Design a protein around this ligand. Structure first.
Ligand code: CHL
Ligand code: CLA
Ligand code: CLA
Ligand code: CLA
Ligand code: CLA
Ligand code: CLA
Ligand code: CLA
Ligand SMILES: CCCCCCCCCCCCCCCC(=O)OC[C@H](COP(=O)(O)OC[C@@H](O)CO)OC(=O)CCCCCCCCCCCCCCC
Ligand SMILES: CC1=C[C@H](O)CC(C)(C)[C@H]1/C=C/C(C)=C/C=C/C(C)=C/C=C/C=C(C)/C=C/C=C(C)/C=C/C1=C(C)C[C@H](O)CC1(C)C
Ligand SMILES: CC1=C[C@H](O)CC(C)(C)[C@H]1/C=C/C(C)=C/C=C/C(C)=C/C=C/C=C(C)/C=C/C=C(C)/C=C/C1=C(C)C[C@H](O)CC1(C)C
Ligand SMILES: CC1=C(/C=C/C(C)=C/C=C/C(C)=C\C=C\C=C(C)\C=C\C=C(C)\C=C\C2=C(C)C[C@H](O)CC2(C)C)C(C)(C)CCC1
Lengths: 217, 210, 165, 194
């Protein structure tokens, strides 16, 4: 049993067979927010969505940023790409955000109804015949059909491993984006610039010398 | 856990490496091959990486070896890392697209035979042409072995293949390292080291840049 | 700007008040030495006054005809003219700390209510349980929303005593 | 079955063997339910017929010297009159949308009221090329295959136009003149790094 703190008392709500089936269960819940099974299920869905969104965003920030350091690309910084993209664009940010909110609200409402009732999106005669593929699998937050075209989820032997690689990576991405914000408010440069500046001199270029993270020193 | 050759005489090797795969020496300190499916995938990955590295090392060393002698041809003084920005009959983008389509076809066929052995031995156009029934993933044979070299000691030849592949993989890694540090072609580095090996080592060369 | 007020960085009465405060402090300082404790204390007070006036003007506060800062409590005006730091953010900050305290106290009462003598625990505070609940109360809004959604936050009408009407 | 899309793979059990153009291609399991398979089958046949008409029209209009498929409705963007085979048409964009809407609504309503019929016959087959049901299965396979090829061709038309700017006939001549120098890899948007 892997634990987030060797020797600490793992909470009872995270030791049940239902909670142990979740990917990345390390018994980490000091505030006890997952004591309620319904709340735990809802938070599991929230964590999965956060993991996938953070992975996509951090990838979209790191890969183009790393390619910009070399001569492969010329993508601006993540904190300035919005203005540059909206300058030579066909629509203002408000109209684009409205269209985005409508398109995202439709799929988010369908996902919400599936969370409230699993497999309820497969109601016949409701989505032009595509409702048959809108039914998720036996595990909430892991649907098939149009999603997962390669069919890598059909093999159970690697399934338990695959989920472990999705949550963990996602958690790392969730921290990465957080760092991307903090560094932006502490150095004023991009993440690749901060990485290069730290690699040039780690004993003097870190958060202990930025003058913000340690105001008492 | 047997009399098979080991990478450390006397060490307690893991039990999942029983000598079935070629070149098994019980070398796995990180235990990356604990999962049988992961080990099955890593075997094919090692074979493919080894063969591509062998072709790469041969294609890096042969032009430089022929360039140092009287043999001459269009691309002679160009280094292996400088061959990309060379003037060819077609642009690099077109060649990249053509090779991506061709490699997509052969790689999907290889993957199909990997997930189902013997399911891709039949030629789609010519129904008469086919590979022999007895086959294993990563070892096609048939038209790929027209000389029938596999009819002899397949174990010894497989051991030779995996050993040469590992050596070529390390050689390609060394090519990248030498090109990034010395900034010169590998045979020139070999000649420089052979001129005076006592004063031309990795420690001396790297200390001169510190 | 809002309500006919002017920014404190441009108000003449604001600068006049700053000059008046510095003038009375300097007048009091004129009777002491130059390297004594009252002189250093008065100089520190003067520097604090200058820093306070500069910080209030830098914050973008609106000053009235009296030269004193005026707060904006309307969320629309505060979010539209950059005044959310006056009454909005401190509102949510107080709500978080107040709900924190209330949730921790409620959890302690519910925890000690199932013991042999709850009144004894009410007069003699169980420090380990109180400390554990105080640390676990950081997620009070999420826990409170979950308790409200499950129906365990409130008590039924049949279990609460009432007067004979 | 018509064949195997992936050699060595097993055909899905939800695809009937007598279905025209059944190559066993369904990795996403979209037609798993029988009710969805019927609608998708009719939709695929209708899409193939419309795509065949569209590709034939685009090829004919660009081969006859009357512009490409993209510049056809440009007359109603800057002021002009539509011309069919070099003959002027006095119908403006406003009268075209109304007549097309009424005609298409009536025809599609009549077609949909039959309960999703894919092969009506009778008035739609005056020559009687599919009178016997024995040869009907073979011709249906040709129809679905030509329709799939036309759908792929129309997608290629749109993609190549959005990538280069020229029409399908102009793109074919350029590729025939310089195959290595003119392809999808040299447009500048398909491959970003190169
Ligand atoms: C294992 C494959 C492989 C490796 C190790 C290299 C390595 C290299 N290539 Mg390269 N290439 C490779 C495949 C291919 N190249 C090209 C086409 C080119 C071109 C056209 C050029 C290179 C160049 C380079 C060098 C600089 C890389 C670069 O531009 O980075 C930037 C990109 C990323 C970091 C991503 C060099 C280190 C350049 C060169 O010669 O520099 C001196 C150059 O101009 N390559 C094609 C298309 C046919 C390839 C494969 O299909
Ligand atoms: C949820 C994640 C996410 C988000 C919110 C963004 C957001 C943004 N990206 Mg980004 N990107 C992401 C992921 C993301 N990206 C990933 C994972 C990659 C690969 C590493 C990239 C690579 C990338 C590049 C190279 C560039 C951007 C750019 C941009 C900005 C312009 C918007 C745009 O591209 O027009 C809208 C885009 C579309 C409507 C999609 C068009 C289809 C694309 C071109 C083909 C990809 C096919 C795929 C199925 C979709 C915008 C702020 C551009 C920029 O920086 O602006 C100056 C830019 O140069 N992105
Ligand atoms: C899979 C391994 C591999 C790869 C990726 C390459 C790749 C390349 N080789 Mg190479 N080569 C290889 C193996 C390989 N080689 C081997 C094993 C040998 C020994 C026989 C050679 C001997 C060789 C020579 C002599 C030359 C190249 C050259 C080249 C470059 C252009 C090839 C060309 O003109 O089109 C393909 C050519 C034909 C199809 C004929 C190219 C980057 C040329 C170069 O250096 O670029 C200037 C060149 O002169 N190769
Ligand atoms: C096929 C393996 C191989 C071989 C034969 C060589 C050979 C050589 N390297 Mg090299 N190298 C290698 C791998 C290899 N390297 C790898 C994997 C890296 C990391 C990326 C490097 C990084 C490197 C640098 C930075 C430098 C060299 C340099 C050199 C040259 C002389 C100094 C030296 O030996 O440094 C020491 C080499 C090593 C510490 C590599 C470790 C030993 C490898 C793994 C071989 C294992 C030995 C094995 C029993 C095989 C023996 C040889 C066999 C063919 C008979 C020399 C000709 C120097 C040079 O370029 O000269 C100007 C130089 O500065 N190498
Ligand atoms: C506690 C009681 C309270 C009171 C008395 C007010 C009073 C006021 N609010 Mg308000 N508001 C409140 C709570 C309150 N608010 C809360 C809890 C929120 C958070 C949801 C908001 C968020 C809010 C916004 C975003 C805005 C106001 C605005 C206003 C002013 C005019 C609009 C109005 O009267 O309709 C009642 C307010 C609402 C129903 C909220 C929606 C805003 C309505 C639709 C009007 C907005 C249209 C336009 C901006 C009107 C001004 C036109 C022109 C002068 C620019 C007005 C003095 C508007 C304003 O003057 O901006 C500076 C403004 O846009 N409020
Ligand atoms: C567990 C502590 C607790 C909690 C959760 C509440 C909660 C509540 N009280 Mg209450 N109250 C408390 C203690 C508490 N009170 C105490 C100790 C007193 C005696 C001074 C009162 C006297 C009181 C009155 C007279 C009224 C309320 C009212 C209310 C309700 C309106 C919100 C409010 O804050 O009013 C204001 C509450 C206060 C001003 C007193 C709060 C005292 C402190 C901040 C609570 C800390 C308690 C304890 C020391 C901390 C736990 C320690 C533990 C971990 C060991 C609300 C549900 C109102 C009501 O009837 O509902 C509509 C009302 O009229 N309370
Ligand atoms: C929208 C047109 C369309 C429709 C409705 C169908 C429907 C069907 N096809 Mg078919 N097919 C099509 C186009 C279409 N196809 C094209 C263009 C090709 C050539 C590549 C094929 C080739 C093909 C083969 C080889 C086979 C089928 C088969 C089938 C049947 C199996 C059920 C199924 O797979 O789910 C239903 C399918 C759908 C509901 C289509 C979903 C549409 C998705 C979203 C398209 C995604 C593509 C993407 C958007 C491309 C645009 C790029 C973007 C950036 C703009 C089914 C009735 C199998 C069969 O048994 O034949 C009877 C089979 O063997 N199809
Ligand atoms: C380097 C890789 C190290 C490596 O993988 O060695 C190989 C060896 C791995 O052995 P195994 O994993 O097979 O252990 C099973 C038994 O055989 C243990 O001997 O590790 C050791 O020898 C343990 C001694 C620590 C060696 C300490 C390093 C030097 C100490 C410096 C002070
Ligand atoms: C568990 C627990 C429980 C216990 O009891 C207690 C405690 C301790 C409290 C805990 C913990 C918690 C935590 C840590 C949390 C965190 C989270 C996060 C961070 C998220 C993020 C998350 C994040 C996310 C999603 C993100 C995303 C991102 C994105 C999209 C991006 C985008 C973009 C791009 C691309 C580029 C451009 O240019 C810009 C932009 C537009 C910007
Ligand atoms: C099967 C499946 C299932 C599994 O499971 C999965 C997946 C993979 C998803 C799948 C696949 C899918 C696909 C491929 C799809 C596609 C489709 C298409 C392409 C369509 C088109 C389609 C197309 C179409 C109709 C088209 C049409 C066209 C037209 C009309 C045209 C017209 C015209 C012309 C004449 C010319 C002029 O100048 C203009 C106009 C007037 C404009
Ligand atoms: C979770 C919690 C506690 C429970 C608290 C409960 C049960 C609260 C219930 C409240 C109920 C039933 C109704 C509340 C209605 C609230 C209303 C009508 C207030 C609306 C707000 C308005 C009109 C505007 C406010 C303002 C905004 C947002 C920003 C600025 O403040 C300025 C201003 C005034 C405009 C327990 C158990 C004591 C434990 C501990 C914390």
């Amino acid at each position: 049993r892997q634990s987030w703190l060797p020797g600490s008392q793992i909470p009872a709500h995270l030791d049940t067979p239902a909670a142990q089936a979740l990917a990345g269960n390390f018994g980490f819940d000091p505030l006890g927010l997952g004591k309620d099974p319904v709340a735990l299920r809802w938070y599991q869905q929230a964590e999965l969505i956060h993991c996938r969104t953070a992975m996509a965003g951090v990838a979209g920030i790191l890969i183009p940023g790393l390619l910009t350091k070399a001569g492969a690309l010329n993508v601006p910084e993540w904190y300035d790409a919005g203005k540059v993209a909206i300058e030579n664009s066909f629509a203002p940010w408000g109209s684009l955000l409205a269209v985005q909110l409508f398109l995202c609200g439709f799929v988010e409402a369908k996902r919400w109804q599936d969370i409230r009732k699993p497999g309820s999106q497969g109601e016949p005669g409701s989505f032009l015949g595509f409702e048959a593929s809108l039914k998720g699998t036996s595990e909430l937050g892991y649907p098939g059909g149009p999603f997962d075209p390669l069919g890598l989820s059909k093999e159970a032997d690697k399934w338990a491993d695959w989920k472990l690689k999705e949550v963990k990576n996602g958690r790392l991405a969730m921290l990465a984006f957080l760092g991307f914000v903090a560094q932006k408010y502490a150095t004023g440069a991009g993440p690749v610039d901060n990485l290069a500046a730290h690699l040039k001199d780690p004993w003097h270029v870190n958060y202990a010398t930025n003058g913000v993270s340690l105001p008492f020193l | 856990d047997a009399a098979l050759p080991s990478w450390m005489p006397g060490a307690d090797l893991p039990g999942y490496l029983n000598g079935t795969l070629p070149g098994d020496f019980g070398f796995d300190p990180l235990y990356l091959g604990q999962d049988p499916v992961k080990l099955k995938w890593y075997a094919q990955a090692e074979l493919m990486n080894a063969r591509f590295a062998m072709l790469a090392v041969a294609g890096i060393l042969v032009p430089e070896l022929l360039s140092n002698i009287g043999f001459s041809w269009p691309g002679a003084g160009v280094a292996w890392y400088d061959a990309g920005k060379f003037e060819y009959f077609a642009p690099a983008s077109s060649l990249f697209g053509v090779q991506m389509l061709l490699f997509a076809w052969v790689e999907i066929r290889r993957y199909q035979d990997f997930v189902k052995p013997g399911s891709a031995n039949q030629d789609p156009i010519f129904t008469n042409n086919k590979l022999p029934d007895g086959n294993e993933p990563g070892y096609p044979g048939g038209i790929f072995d027209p000389f029938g070299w596999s009819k002899g000691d397949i174990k010894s030849l497989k051991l030779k293949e995996i050993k040469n592949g590992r050596l070529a993989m390390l050689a390609f890694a060394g090519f990248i390292g030498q090109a990034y540090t010395t900034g010169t072609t590998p045979l020139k580095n070999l000649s420089t080291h052979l001129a005076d090996p006592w004063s031309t080592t990795v420690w001396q060369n790297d200390l001169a840049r510190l | 700007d809002i309500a006919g007020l002017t920014p404190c960085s441009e108000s003449k009465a604001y600068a006049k008040l700053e000059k008046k405060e510095l003038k009375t402090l300097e007048k009091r300082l004129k009777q002491y030495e130059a390297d004594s404790a009252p002189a250093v204390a008065l100089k520190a007070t003067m520097e604090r006054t200058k820093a306070r006036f500069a910080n209030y003007a830098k914050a973008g506060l609106l000053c009235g005809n009296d030269g004193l800062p005026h707060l904006i409590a309307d969320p629309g005006l505060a979010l539209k003219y950059g005044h959310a730091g006056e009454v909005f953010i401190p509102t949510f900050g107080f709500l978080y700390v107040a709900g924190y305290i209330g949730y921790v106290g409620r959890q302690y009462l519910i925890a000690v209510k199932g013991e042999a003598k709850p009144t004894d625990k009410e007069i003699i505070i169980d420090v380990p349980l109180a400390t554990k609940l105080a640390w676990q109360g950081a997620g009070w809004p999420l826990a409170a929303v979950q308790e409200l959604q499950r129906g365990t936050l409130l008590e039924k009408e049949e279990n609460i005593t009432v007067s004979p009407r | 079955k018509a064949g195997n899309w992936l050699p060595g793979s097993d055909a899905p059990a939800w695809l009937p063997d007598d279905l025209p153009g059944n190559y066993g291609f369904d990795p996403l399991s979209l037609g798993k339910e029988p009710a969805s398979l019927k609608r998708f089958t009719e939709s695929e046949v209708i899409h193939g017929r419309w795509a065949m008409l569209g590709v034939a029209g685009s090829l004919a209009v660009e081969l006859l010297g009357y512009g490409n498929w993209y510049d056809a409705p440009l007359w109603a963007v800057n002021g002009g009159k539509a011309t069919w085979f070099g003959i002027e048409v006095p119908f403006d964009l406003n009268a075209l949308l109304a007549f097309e809407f009424v005609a298409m609504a009536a025809a599609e309503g009549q077609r949909g009221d039959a309960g999703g019929v894919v092969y009506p016959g009778g008035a739609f087959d005056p020559l009687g090329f599919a009178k016997d049901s024995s040869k009907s299965g073979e011709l249906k396979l040709k129809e679905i295959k030509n329709g799939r090829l036309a759908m792929v061709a129309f997608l290629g038309f749109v993609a190549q136009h959005a990538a280069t700017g020229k029409g399908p006939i102009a793109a074919l001549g350029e590729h025939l003149a310089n195959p290595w120098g003119a392809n999808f890899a040299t447009n500048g948007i398909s491959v970003p790094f190169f």
